[PDB]
């Protein structure tokens, strides 16, 4: 099974990249259910994570760096929901764009990555229930998994990546 992200404009085949981690935001306020939605503040959050490749993207780190043995989540303050959660992967997930306006990600590989990221967020926050919800909303560069590629700029809808619960 596969997950197809709608991207406009259509990225060419040679923008087929590796996802090496992402950036989350814990939704504040208030059941023992913690809710994370992919961060989309300003380019400086994505910068500060420093698991950043030359490819200047949002939501997901494309062609960034990988951790060693396993997933490592990081934050400047676990209590400040304003402060993002830099998730860094160990083993990358391939995003492949057919150039028909569609980019594809293995459902297996991604679900696996969520399981792990959930586990670590659980260690940190001590809860039981980890909910991934889509982008909270904002300017188009963030509310969508955006990126540059060959000088051209693309956007992708990613609400299909972040919509699950874990226990």
């Amino acid at each position, epitope marked *: 099974d596969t997950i197809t992200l709608p991207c406009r404009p259509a990225p060419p085949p040679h923008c087929s990249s590796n996802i090496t981690g992402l950036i989350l935001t814990r939704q504040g306020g208030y059941a023992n259910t913690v809710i994370f939605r992919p961060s989309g*503040g*300003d*380019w*400086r*959050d994505i*910068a*500060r994570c420093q698991i950043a490749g*030359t490819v*200047v993207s949002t939501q997901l780190f494309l062609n960034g760096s990988l951790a060693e043995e396993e997933v490592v989540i990081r934050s*400047e*303050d676990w209590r400040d929901n304003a402060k993002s959660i830099c998730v860094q992967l160990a083993t990358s997930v391939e995003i492949a764009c057919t150039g028909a306006g569609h980019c594809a990600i293995s459902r297996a590989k991604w679900a696996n990555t969520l399981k792990q990221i959930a586990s670590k967020l659980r260690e940190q926050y001590g809860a039981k229930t980890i909910i991934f919800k889509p982008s909270s909303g904002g300017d188009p*560069e963030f509310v969508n998994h955006s990126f*540059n*590629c060959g*000088g*051209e*700029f693309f956007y992708c809808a990613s609400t299909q990546l972040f919509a699950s619960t874990w226990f």
Partner: antibody, heavy 119, light 108 residues
Framework: QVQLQESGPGLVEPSGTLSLTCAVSGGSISSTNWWTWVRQTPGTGLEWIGEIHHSGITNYNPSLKSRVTISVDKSKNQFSLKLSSVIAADTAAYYC????????????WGQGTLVTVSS | DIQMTQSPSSLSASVGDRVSITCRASQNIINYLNWYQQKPGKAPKLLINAASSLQSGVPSRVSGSGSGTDFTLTISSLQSEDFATYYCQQSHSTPPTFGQGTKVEIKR
């Protein structure tokens, strides 16, 4: 080393638009850096306007979004600032400066150019 | 925006003296703070980045410290040619905010 010189008119009567060009010498605008415009007014201080990546990405100060445009001319090896609907409030000195991988520091600056909004 | 309040705004020291300028940020900005020197009618000169990394080309007299909500610029042996205004600058989050400035006047 890298060097920046601004160019463009130091007078713009109200309503109209301020066009201004940073010419980059001894370094490409197609590097790994961002390129920034900052204005400075006596009494008011330093205000960051916006920045642009070599890949057409554009960050603008919230306060000026409705009015501001930054562009990259890769053929001429320059970048440019265009402010529409200018008011007397915009009477200031306009610098083009190159940071260093949006890592904090605005490393090299241009000599800046003064711009009056007067009729 | 992140509010950068310098301290003081205007000071008066001697040739050889030790100058200290503070910069308080509204939010925790980690260590993403930069110090600029600007002499009259000239473009700002990057003294310090990351609140401590002496930009190459500046004297070692100049030094930087702090991390969080408070930072310090120190000039450990002031000279005739340090007559300038000094600015602390945000870098953690757009917009990069600046400080109002500190006016170091040489006393003689």
């Amino acid at each position: 080393q890298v060097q920046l010189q601004e160019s463009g008119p130091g007078l713009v009567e109200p309503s109209g638009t301020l066009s201004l060009t940073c010419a980059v010498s001894g370094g490409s605008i197609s590097s790994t850096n961002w390129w920034t415009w900052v204005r400075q007014t006596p009494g008011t201080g330093l205000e960051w306007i916006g920045e642009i990546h070599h890949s057409g990405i554009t960050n603008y100060n919230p306060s000026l979004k409705s009015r501001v445009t930054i562009s990259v001319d890769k053929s001429k090896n320059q970048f440019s600032l265009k402010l529409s609907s200018v008011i007397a409030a915009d009477t200031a000195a306009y610098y083009c400066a190159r940071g260093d991988d949006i890592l904090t520091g605005y490393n090299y600056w241009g000599q800046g150019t003064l711009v009056t909004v007067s009729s | 925006d992140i509010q950068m309040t310098q301290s003081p705004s205007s000071l008066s020291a001697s040739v050889g003296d030790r100058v200290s300028i503070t910069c308080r940020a509204s939010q925790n900005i980690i260590n993403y703070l930069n110090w600029y020197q600007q002499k009259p009618g000239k473009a700002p000169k990057l003294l310090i980045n990351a609140a401590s990394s002496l930009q190459s080309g500046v004297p070692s007299r100049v030094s930087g410290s702090g991390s969080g909500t408070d930072f310090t610029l120190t000039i450990s042996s002031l000279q005739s040619e340090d007559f300038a205004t000094y600015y602390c600058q945000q870098s953690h989050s757009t917009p990069p905010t600046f400080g109002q400035g500190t006016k170091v006047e040489i006393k003689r």
